[PDB]
Every structure is written in structure tokens, then in C-alpha cells.
């Protein structure tokens, strides 16, 4: 603390008053990075308010000056301005006045649809919930898309990650899971709805903007929050926005209702925090980020937890977004984050171009939850279909050059062909659970093996709405039964056999 | 709000050489807090224990204050010197008591107008040459200006006269003119 | 109030003030200088000393040459007496044609519009060019990035999109040449007095251009793309217009920002650049965006170095984009004009909603066609042709004659192609599209559907033969 | 989708000698004509 | 990556060594 | 002494003492916190000042904040009474069963025991697991390694291993979960609950749980193995018991401290790393060992960064260790679990002296196919199965035969795949892949050796698919 | 410095004299650091530039204004195709027409002196030094 207005007065032993332990002066501002002469009682990680309204966060105290991030554009910081403490460390309103609303990374309503009525705040940093209040991963996830809730499954409590290069449709599997549950909150049962929530990380304003259109069109929006931390904004609110938003998440899980967050993209996080460290003089690691950049996701996906029925019995799921670079995941922040979550589910752009959409590379898509994080319906297809999968697998090759196959073979190379076309799903509609284990139990037991391939999704439209309105007793039967008895196995394909001979 | 100082003195040591010229010409002891830290230096050189002692960063700050306030009763240092050591054991910035002396040396010398000048000759010489020497010198002074002049000697410019100002020169010697007129006779043709 | 030079590095300049300092991002004026020299504040360094980024030459300057605040940002003519004018940064006129007589000026430096002031609606700009129209179609209003390296071809596509849109335009337009070649905006300039969109005889001119090229210093050349935002920016909000804003080339943007940032004293971040790539990237990009009031449709060539994706300085370009266009250079090299990568290439607005059903459908058959040869090249490369008989040899014999249909002689290359250039309707390209896929075009040579516009135009080709 | 066999070691689907380590379509080769002879053989 | 081009260009040379090897046996 | 806090930066703070400073290593409780936060000295700075790393969140710190110095290293309780309990990095019980009376502490920064206190003894573990017991066998009171990438398998195995060994061991055992996913701790905890390892009404626990975090801060990720290190050895010295320690993961030890060195004031070394990366993880290895006076049995799980084995992090590790056993992708995509590569897996006492002459000859035999398998495969790519003879053709057949028999089902596992749990006792594995190798089922079909235990099994799952066929 | 005194000099990067023929009786100077022209200077390249090769002023045709790069790897031609071009000169530089005359500037940046001498060597013999200027930074 060496400046010359300070030593000078310093020689006169002047003993100057207004004293700098609840307020400090600007020494220099530049580049969103404050720093601030005085505050001696200032807390790590707290709260300022600038003489220009703006606000900041005191992330390096030093004996001489305080390193201090900027919440917005630094033109209104001056060398020389005053700085007051907050006196707590950030925090964002919660509850669910927020559900219908666009904010912020600090809570801020941006939709110009008034203030916001919320009661309580809760700080963005609280501690992970530990080993005793969490419960193991039970309850089922549903994305809506065959092939995630067949092979790569989500429970409620779990940390999933959507990985892939750039338009492989990261975004399209995180926007389907929040207008899949649209059939879940519109039912009576309280367990089974889920409340979304979509953290927007350094992308456009149009683009959030065509995505609440989107989400409001579909009628989404009523249970979803969006929280929009775009390019335009600092680097500071696009770092705090996945806390944020998993504070808000928080509030739903620890009252005993089950919540879903969407961090659209933690990679962009990443390079929001690696500026703010470069611009505090913190020294970089590699590609230039910061030493914490782990702990930097580590502590905010932890949060994501199944909480025990002594806790209110409440989930945070957590579907964290990371972009790859030409499908590179040895980099710094895709390994990261692989090795933080309980599963991932890799895109690539040749199953994109290849007709596979959602272009989900199921060798590569692992989900250590596994089979609780299905029904006992789907359990029980799913299973047959990934050891069937798992056979195509061996006989898909035999296109290349082979010219003649063994009968039995050839049934499975037909019915994998079937099973593969029928993993394929088109954008925005996700589709129930009873009629993704129905199409799967008619791919995996020979009933689309005198299919042809393109007319898959013909039938399975036409064919479902034939069991709707006319077998809906079997639908009762199954659901009271909870899978699918011999009797019903029967029964489904003698309705199979006679809509097909109706085909 | 700070004094201008006469001249832009850099580096940390200069700050601190231009935050006490400015609190002495706030008040009125720019003479004062100029001798006794004369007085200090000229101390620490011809002591040149104290000088060890107080660069030493292994001993404690109270015992580097202890030595400097025993040593600064006997300067008659009253209120800004005794302050400025304080400050400057107070920092780790003791180890250059002598860099901030030289640049608060050089604000009061130009706070006096004095302009340095250096003047080479071959051989020493006086009667003629230093009076003459002298009124050449004045020449160069704007009104309120007093001359600091360092005569040297040195053979190797064979002879002539090499004389500097505070910021020019020139080099009117006989061993730099020679040597330029035999480049003129290797890149005559 | 005034201030003088401390410290003269490259284009950073420091300069200390007396009594009160000059905001962040506020305009200065150096005094003895015969021609304008203006230094940026970029950020406060402490004991009333400004570090500054200075939009001309630093040569000639010297410590404790008196600066002027002006007291505001750089601002810039804008309104319609920038129509058929050249400025520069600063907005000086560089046409030699008197000063820019107006009422109106705008500071470069604006806040992006928010939330509230965002249009959702997407409809398809038909451009004429078949690769562009078929796989990653603009969008009418929204932000269009050209991708690709040096020689591929981005400014002879930016010339064809500005022959093709902005000549039929009810509008105005915008041309913001960043770090480019001062031949190329002497060519643009002379094309637009003589295609009429510049008049200089009356007031029916239909283009503003602002020029900052690679002979300028960083700090021009890191601003001049805001001096083009800026006029775009009055055109959509203070006159309501639909404004076309063509940026050649928005990668210079951010190489000037990690030339200046060298020289800022930060601690440098991936591949050399700037640690506020990506915030000063998005507070420039998001200003280009249409809202409720007007629209405004930008074309941005962008530059890769060393032909890669992968720069930190493309990689978070795509994000900013509705549509993208991937410029490839062994594309390029097979003599495939324009060299548009089919399977890089996005719209965002590749919707069957947007586009219709048999539009999506022969696109996507398209690219599934193309991405089937991709995989079968390895084998073809070692191995050969003898692959799987009919059924790979009939996939390699579409996907070349899909290959060479997306190549389209331009009428801006009719100069050193000889072939005339082709505006070929959407109708027509889904409809030769379509031909191809059915298979209707087997039994003609792969040399007819080269450098040909309408698939009528490929079977006239290949009866000649 | 599913991780063909010889489409790399660690890319979803693989893993032995060079070809079937380095993918592409050469691996697919291989695992096409080796799963084609002992598919046969049972 | 390295490791990546490096495990290609040794496939490609054992691929050569066999054509060749078939090439003089043909 | 006292201090206060003189900087705050991430999880690295500065300290300054007025009165003699502490020692390196020594913990300073800072005294106006609720939930006990507690900075260990890493270096004296100078000018009566030393610098410190967090064992937990450093939200609220003040500058000029009291610190205590508590004259000692980080003390952990230490004994019987851990058994059964779980442990933070500092010794406090959070698995919210009370506090842990007892009357032994031990510090958590000790020397390693000397080179005349080393034991040579080399016995052969056995696990259950096929390719584990035949091609990298274990040592009991041996360190055992278990590197992979994320996803391959290391979880998995390490809890195959505490099902198939801790259950019925015979002595204590210790788990430190270093820098892992709080759900894998709940979900450990209960199956140790299950199990009747963890008896919360009796005092016959037998193991000790010690746990810190992805959510912890890297001061507490960067000490919390040398804790759950610390019970294990109170159990090998001041008892003289056989201990199993089980690390999950070791990786997290190194990556911990790579996060504060920056901050630390160091440069950083190759790939991007704390300069004292085999220093660092040298004095925290040599600690686990097999003593004169007892034995320690290390299973560590170490993650290989990208699937990178010449990543620093694990190649340091590979020269700590008895046994490593290396999960490969590859294996894993194949469907063969567990998916230890078998040309990459190394064990110390694979020799003809200790695990027998037959042992090591069908071993190597095993190794010899697979790897003879990797060399054809090109061949294969270019010539075809047509062209190959019938030598190269057994040659194919009997490593498909060998590939498919080294995986095996897990009762860990069960819930994943359904499949039932086996365990295989070494003598079966020798003759089951001696039959193989001799070619004794030549006429069977290799999909008869996939997941099944002993090849008893995989003559009658040849018989059932030849009569449901 | 700058001008006609330059021509038939080899200088180095200061502008001082190297080839031992005496100095240089310049009145001019140029700053090096002189911005380039703007838009409205100048005009479209429309006079050609003969460089005396075939394959060059057929296929890639060279103008008087233009930047053209000579591209390869090592000791592949292009100091031959660049001294070349300076050579073909000596026919519009003999000739009575002024607007064909084209003057010459080599700058050798970090090649071998000996280098240097061998190409004014070859400019000496074929007179095409007469209207060449060297500026050698080896
Ligand atoms: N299952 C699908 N079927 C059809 N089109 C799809 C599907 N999933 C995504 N798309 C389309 O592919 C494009 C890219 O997908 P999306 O934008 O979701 O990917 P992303 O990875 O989020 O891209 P970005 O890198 O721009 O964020 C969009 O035009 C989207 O409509
Ligand atoms: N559509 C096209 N038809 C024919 N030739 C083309 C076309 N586009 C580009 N080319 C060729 O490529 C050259 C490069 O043109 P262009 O200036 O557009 O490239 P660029 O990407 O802007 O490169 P630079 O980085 O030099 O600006 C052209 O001069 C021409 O030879
Ligand atoms: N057209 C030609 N006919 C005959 N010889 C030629 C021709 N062009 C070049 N050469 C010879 O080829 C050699 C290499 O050419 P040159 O030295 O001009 O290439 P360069 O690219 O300048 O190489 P360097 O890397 O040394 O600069 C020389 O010996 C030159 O005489
Ligand atoms: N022995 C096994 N049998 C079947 N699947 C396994 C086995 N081991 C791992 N897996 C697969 O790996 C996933 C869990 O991997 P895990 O052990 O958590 O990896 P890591 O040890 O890297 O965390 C599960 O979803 C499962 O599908
Ligand atoms: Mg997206
Ligand atoms: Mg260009
Ligand atoms: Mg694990
Ligand atoms: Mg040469």
C-alpha cells in the first residue's frame, strides 16, 4: 500500500479521516478488473457496489490493493471512485415466482415481464450436500428420445453430459428433455413432475431469445427458468450464471420436488473464467486456464444430488453442455468434465450426416447409473435390445464385401438395420415412455422385420395410435403389470400381425 | 492533491523522493528535512555498519526503528524526516535509503535551477582556462540558474574539450575530430 | 481536462491528466499533429495515468506532448449523408469529395440491444447460389459468417452476395472493409459507381462505405468494424430500415485486438491471443442482430489462420452466426467453385418448417450421400474402385455428380473464368437435386454437371458431348 | 451409431492391431471378413 | 492429435509392407 | 503463537505471525469460523509471513483475521473407533453418527519406513478374477494399481476387489475416496452397511471410510489420501494387522496439488504440473508399504488423463507399484469386462519361482496368442481370412477363444447387466485357458466363452446354444 | 536516401554504400515507415509487367502495381524467376519510350553475401545493373 497521496499523508502524519474499512478508492480499472485501495474488512468472495451503481466481487484480497471483477461494462469505473461493501457475498433470489421468467446471472428479470415476488435468496456458493443426506439414484429421468432413455438412461440426481463438436445437437437433446416433461407436470402425480431450468452461458440473444419462443410455443415455459448469461455480458456474470441457476435448482430440490438444470455451455464458463484469472494476473496452466478450472465445475455439478426421504426425498439432475473441437476430448476442459459427470453422451458430425439424428455414439455413451435409472418396462426391453444391438454389431459389417449370410444372420442383420432406424427421432418431438418401450418391444422381438426401413416412423405413428383409442385395456394392463407378461406379449403381436396384415 | 516537483524523478524511490518534497513544501521545512538527510547519508557512508544493519532483512523492523530513531535524535530531526524512515522501515523499503536520498539530492537540485555540467580536458588547467570556462557556462543559463561543474581528466581524447549539460553534449576533442577525418580519407573514394 | 504523453509503445500510448481523468473508451486528441491522430482510453493505470490505443501512426510523438479530452467516445457521422461516402475510423471522409455535412453523429462504442428488443422470426434469403441455397440456407435478417482461409474465396463470394442481394434491395447497405487489401476497396468503390448503387451526381446512392485496411495501425483496424456497426446501427433503429452489413473480414477485428493486447501488459492466453477474445467478440457481435424496430442482415467473411477450425478466434465466431458457410481449400483445389464445405456448412433455419419438407429432405440427402463418400474414400484411395459392385460404385457415381453440381460459375469470376455467371431460383436447385438423388442422371458423364447453373443447363452439357 | 467394429480403439468401436487402432475403414475391413469367417464356422 | 497420426502412419506402413510383400509374390 | 491473515487468493492464504513463526507442514485453525476451516503451512515467505493452502472453502476470509497455530501437523483420530466411521481430510466424523471418542491421534505427515524395515515377502492374492490372477497375479501386502481413462472401469473393479477380498479377509481395511463423486461414497457406504463390514449397532466394523471430494477444495483433495494413509498405517504399525488400503483415486492426489502450486509461486512443469509432481507422490507412496511389522494391501485406482499413459501423472505412478493392472477402451468397447488390456498389465511376482512353472508358461502362453492376434490383424485387413493358412487360422481362433474367456461377470456388477456374479478359483483359470491354448476346444464357439466363470460353463453354454440352435 | 543516385548501388539497409564505389550524391530522403496509399490514389492495374518467362506472363500474368509472391520450397527457382524478371527490363529500358521503363529494387533479406555478389555479378554482365538498386541485409 504504497501510493502517493498515501505516503504523502503518511509523512505529515496527517491521520486522515474517512477510513477505508468499509469503503476503498479505485487505484485501477481496466478490463472488467478493479483494484481497490482500502475495504479492510472486505470478506473473500463478497459483494461491492460501485459509486456508479454497478456492482462487483472481491475475488483476490491483498495486503496493498483488492482484485475486484466487474458486473458489467468498466466506462462507469473511474480511478479514484468509491467503493462500498455489501457485506455479504453473492446471492439470487429463489422460489417459484421465477418459473416463466428470463433472468439474468444475478436475478434480474431481462423479459420485461415486471419484478419478481421472490421471498427468500440464497448465495450461488453454498456447500455440496455430503455422503448421508443423499440417497441413491432411483427414480427415472425421462429425456423423452429413444435412444437416451434406452441406452444411455438418466436418473433423477444425476449429472449427465451432453458432449459433442458444434450443430451435432447438444442443445436439441437439452430442449426435448425440458418439452418432455410437459406430460409430467400437466398429470396429478406431484412425484413424477419436474421443473427445469435452462442457464444460457455466453451464447446470443437471439438464440435464447428463438429459445424461450420456442419453449413458450410448446408450453414449456410455465415450469422452466432461463436463466441468459449472453456474449454481451461480462465475463463475471457468465461465470456466475451455472451457480445461479444451480441455486435456483437448489431451492426446488431441498424443499422436497425434483428439478432439472441445463448448463448451456460450460465450456463458454470456462473461457468467462480463464479471463477473469488472466486479467487478476493469476498465472495460467494449460491452454491457459487457470489451475481451479477443475474445481471450477467439480463444485458446481456436485450439487446436483438425489436427496434422502429424511431430506424431503427432492433430486437436482444436471445436464452440463461441453463443445469438442473437431470431436478432440483430449483437451482440458472435455476430460474435466467426462471425469466429473456419471455419464456422457457423445455427438459426432458423421452420424449427424449420416441420417442418425439425435447422432448419439452409443460405443462411446456410457451412464453409470445403468438400469435403476429405467422402468421395469423399459429395463426389460432395453436389455434385449442392447444385447441385439450388441449383435448387429458383430454382423453390421458383413455390407462391405460379403455377398452371402446364414438365415439367422440375416435376421439379425435386419433386425439391428430396424433397431438402428429406430433409434432415429426427429427434433422437438419427444415422445412418452409407453410409447418408446412399445415401438422397442416391436424392434427387438421380430415385428418390423417385414417393415421396410423408411417406413419405420409411418408405423410408428399409425400403429401407436391404433393401440391408443382401440387397445387401450392392454395400455391399463401393462401399466397396472408394470412390464410384459407372455399373455401380453401374445396379445401385442396378434394386434401387431393383424395391423400389419391391415398395412 | 501533491506538489509538481522541479523534475520527474522515476521508480518507486523517486515516488517516495517526490511524496516528502511535497509534505516539506506544504510546510516549511524544505531546508531542514534537506540537511538532516545529508547529514543521515553522509552518516551512513562513513558508518558503513549502519548501513548493513538497516539493509540486513533477517533483523525485526522494530530493532531497524530502534537504530534509526537513535540515530535521527542526534540529526535534530523534528517531524517529516523522522516520519519518512518510519514509513520506509515500515514497508520493506529500507534497503534503498540511499536510492531515495540521491533522488530527493536530485529534485532539490533543480529545485535551486543548478544544471550539471561536466567538462573533460586532457590536461587540468586554471587562471586562463577556468575563467574563461566559466563565462562560456554562464551563457547557457536561462535567469535563476546556478552551475555544478565537474572537471575530469582523461588522455585518451589526445586534447580539445569535451563539455556536457544536463542534457547535451558535444565533442569538440581532437581524438574524436582526427577520427572522422581519417573515415573521410577510407570513404573519400 | 488536458493530459500529456508519458509513454509511447507502439500503438499504446500512456498519457497522465492534472486534474480530472478521461472516462474508459472516451475520445483524445493529440495537439501537434497535422493530420487528426485520436487516442482510445482502454484503462486507468493509477496516479492519474490513462493507458490509451491510438486509431493512427504513433511516430513523432514525444513525452510531454500536450492531450486533449474530448470528453466523449469516438463518434461518427451517420444518417443518409454517409450514403455514397467512404470514412474512415474516425469517420473523416477518405473519398476526396468534401466533408460529411451532417446533424447526426453516434459514438462507436453502444450497449447491444436486450432481451426484450429481439426479433424470432426466420425467413429463407434466396441467394441464387445452389450449395448456399440447398444445405445452408441465410436467413432473411440474421448474422451469415464465411469461413475459410487465404485464396479459398470469401471475397469473391461477398462480391457475388452483394451483386446478387444488394443490388435488388430495398434498403440500405453497409460495407466495413477490416483489415483488407485497399485494391480490393478501390475494385468494390469503382463497382459500385458504376453499377449505380454509389451516385456521385445526386442523393440516390444505397451504400455507406467505412474502410480500415491492413496498412492501418491495430488500433484502427480493431475499431473500424465498430465504425461500420455504428452507421448500420442508425440506418435499423433512428430510420426503421432493413440494412445489409457486409464485414470483410471480421477476423481482423480480433487479430488487431491480440496485436494491441501484446502491448497492454496482460498475461496473453491461447495461441497468443488475447485473454478477452471471446468478451470483446460478443460485445462487438451482438450489436449486429435485428430487433423490433429494423432488421439488419450481415455478411462476415471470417479468416482462418494456417486453414484452421480449430484457432481460437474462428471457434467463437460460430457461435455468434445463424448460418455459417465453410470455405475449404481441398475443395478448392478439385476446381469446385465456390469451395463450400457441404458437411460444414449450418443455417440454423434447415428446418421443415422453415423450408419445407422437399427442400429439407433432398438436403439431407444430399449431405448423407456426401458423407457415405467421405467414408468410402479411404477404401478408394488404397484400395480402388472394385468396391461392393453396383452399390458403393452407384454412391461414388452420385456423390461426384452431386459434387460437381454444387459448383456454380459466379457473374463476379466471369472476369478470369470465361464461364458466365449463373443465378440459378431454388426451385430449379432442388429440382436438379432431386434428379440427381432419384437417379434420373445416372447414365450422363460427371463432366456435365460441372460449372453449370440448371440442371437443364447439365443435360444440354452433356448432349454437346 | 453403435460403435462398429474397427472404427478405432477408443472411437466407440475397436481395439487390436494397427489397422483395427488407427479405424477408418480398413478396420471395418477387417472385422467384416474376420466375423464373416467365424460366423460361418458356427 | 500426435498420438492419432502416429498410430495411423504405422498402419499405413505395415498396409504398404503387405502390398508390397503381395505385390513381388503376384 | 498468533496470527492474521495478510492475503486471500483462491484457496492459497498468507499468514503473518508476530511471535516465532510455525513450521512447514504444521495446521493453523483460523479462529473466527463456524465450520472449523484450518490451513496447513506450505512455505515460510519471509518477512514473518507464511503462505498456506485451505482444507476447505475460503468464502468470508478477512484480511487481518486471528489464526491459531495448534504447534503440530494436521492430527486425525486414529484406532478402532474409526472403524466403521467416515472421516473428512481433518479427522471430523460426517457421517452424522456423533463424534469419534477415542484416545490415539496420529499426524498425517509422517517419514516412510527405512530400507532395513522392508519386507521381501511375495505370496500370490487371489481375487477371483481371470485375467487378474492369471496374467498380472497380486502380492499379498503388495501395492496394486489400477490405471484406466474415465469410464473404463475402475470403480467397478475396486469395488469387485473390497466384495471378493475385504469381505472375508481377516484383519482391518481402510477406504480413501480421494476426489470422487459424492453419490459413489453414499452408494459404497450402504453396501458396506449391506455387507455387515459396516455394523452400526456393533462394534464388528472392519473398515474405515476416509473421504474427500470433487466438491472439496484442493487443499483438502491434496491431503485427504495421506489421512485415509494415516489410519492405515495406526492399523500396520501400532497394531501389527494385515490392512487393505483401497484409494479411489490416486490421480486426484497430484491433480489437487497442481491446482494451488500455481498459486504457490512456482513455475509450472511438462504438460502443466506442480514442479514437485514425483517428490510430492514419492513421499506419499513410500508411506504405503509393507513394513517388518505389518502388511499393507494397496488397491489404487489411478486415472490416466485422455487415456494418455505417457501422461506424468500415471507414469509416475507405474514405478510405486507391485502389480498394475491397465483398463484399456479398447477392451472395454470390445464388451469384454473387465477390460484390463492384457499386453499392457504387469505383476512383480509373475515369475516360474513363484506362482509355479505352469502358471507362468500358460501366462505367457496367453500373452504370446493375443499378442501374435495383433500382429495378424493387419494381415487380415489386406489379405483377408481367405489367405492365411490354417496356422495363422487356430492362431485367430484361439485368441478370440482366449479375448472372450478373460472377461467375466461381476457381482458388482449384477445390477448393470444382469448377469450372475462368479468367482473363479486360480486353479480353474490355469486349466481352463491350458484347454485353450492346447486346443482341446477348437470345435466350440467363442461366443461360448464370453462372460462365463470357469469353463465347465463354457461347455455348457456350447451345450445349451447347440440344443436351443 | 532516395533517387536516381541509387541505381547501380548495392547498399545495405540504412542506405549506406557497400559495394565500395564511393558515396552516394543523394538530396533526398524517404521515411521507411510511410503509410500506403488510400483508396482514392489508386487506379486498377492495367499495364503489364514482362517478367520474360512463358509460363509466368501466359498463365499468371503480372501487372505494374500489382503483389504477386513467388511461393516454393527451397532451391526450386524462385531467385531465378525474380532476377529473371529484372533482367527482361534491359529492352524497355534501352528503348526511347519512357512509359514501358521500369526500374528495379533487389532486397536480399538473410541470404549468404556471396550470394548477393554472384546475382550483381549477373546484373553487372547483363547491364541490367544500370537500373537496379540492392539493397542487402544478408
Ligand atoms: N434430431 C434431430 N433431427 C433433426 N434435426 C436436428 C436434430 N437435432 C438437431 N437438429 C438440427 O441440427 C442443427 C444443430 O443442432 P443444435 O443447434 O441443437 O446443436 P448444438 O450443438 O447446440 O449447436 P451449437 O454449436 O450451435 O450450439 C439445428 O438446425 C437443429 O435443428
Ligand atoms: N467463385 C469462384 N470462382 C472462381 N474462382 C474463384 C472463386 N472464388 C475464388 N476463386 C479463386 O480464388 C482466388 C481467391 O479469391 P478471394 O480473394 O475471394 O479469396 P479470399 O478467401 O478472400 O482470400 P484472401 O485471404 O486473399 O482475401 C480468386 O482470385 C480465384 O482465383
Ligand atoms: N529455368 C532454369 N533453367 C536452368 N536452371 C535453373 C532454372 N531455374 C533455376 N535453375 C537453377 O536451379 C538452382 C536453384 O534455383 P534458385 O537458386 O534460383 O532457387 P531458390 O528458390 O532461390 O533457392 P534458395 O533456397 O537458394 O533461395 C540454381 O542453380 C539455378 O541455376
Ligand atoms: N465389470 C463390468 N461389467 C460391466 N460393465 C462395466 C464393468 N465395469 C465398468 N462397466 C461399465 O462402466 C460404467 C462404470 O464405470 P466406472 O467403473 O464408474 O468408471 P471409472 O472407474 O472410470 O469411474 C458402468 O456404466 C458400466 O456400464
Ligand atoms: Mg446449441
Ligand atoms: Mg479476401
Ligand atoms: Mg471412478
Ligand atoms: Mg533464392
Redesign the interface.
Known sequence: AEISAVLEEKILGAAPKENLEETGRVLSIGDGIARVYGLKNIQAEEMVEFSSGLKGMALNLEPDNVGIVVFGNDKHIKEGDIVKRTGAIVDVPVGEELLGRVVDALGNPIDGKGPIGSKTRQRVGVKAPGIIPRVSVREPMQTGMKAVDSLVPIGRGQRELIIGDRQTGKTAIAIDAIINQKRFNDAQDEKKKLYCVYVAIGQKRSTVAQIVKRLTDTDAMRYTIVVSATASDAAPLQYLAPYSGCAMGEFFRDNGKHALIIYDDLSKQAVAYRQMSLLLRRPPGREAYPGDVFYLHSRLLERAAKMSESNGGGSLTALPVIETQAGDVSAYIPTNVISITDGQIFLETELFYKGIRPAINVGLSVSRVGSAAQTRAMKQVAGSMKLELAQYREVAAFAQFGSDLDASTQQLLSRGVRLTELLKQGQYVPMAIEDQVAIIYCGVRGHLDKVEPSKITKFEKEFSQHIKTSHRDILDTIAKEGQISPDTDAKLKKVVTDFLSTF | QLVKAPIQVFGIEGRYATALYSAAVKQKKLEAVEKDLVQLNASLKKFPRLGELLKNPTLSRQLKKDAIGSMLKEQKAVDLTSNFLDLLTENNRLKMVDGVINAFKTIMAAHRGEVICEVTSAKPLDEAARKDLEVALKGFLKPGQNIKLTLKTDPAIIGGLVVSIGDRFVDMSIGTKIKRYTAALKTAV | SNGQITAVIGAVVDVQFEDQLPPILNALEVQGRSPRLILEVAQHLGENTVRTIAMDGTEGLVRGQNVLDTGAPIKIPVGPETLGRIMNVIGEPIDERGPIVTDKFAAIHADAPEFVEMSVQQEILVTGIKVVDLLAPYAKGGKIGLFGGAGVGKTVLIMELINNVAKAHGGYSVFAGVGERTREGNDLYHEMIESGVISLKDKTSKVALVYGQMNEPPGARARVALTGLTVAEYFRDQEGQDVLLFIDNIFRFTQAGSEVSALLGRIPSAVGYQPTLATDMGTMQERITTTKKGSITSVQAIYVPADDLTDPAPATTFAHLDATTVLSRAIAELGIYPAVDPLDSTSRILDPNIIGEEHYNIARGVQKILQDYKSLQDIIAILGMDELSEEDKLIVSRARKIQRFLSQPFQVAEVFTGHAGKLVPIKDTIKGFKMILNGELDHLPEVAFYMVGPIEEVVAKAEKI | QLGELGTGAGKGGGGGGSVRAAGGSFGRREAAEEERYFRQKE | ?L?AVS??L???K??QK??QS?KMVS
Open positions: 492429435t498420438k498410430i495411423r504405422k498402419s499405413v505395415n498396409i503387405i502390398t503381395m
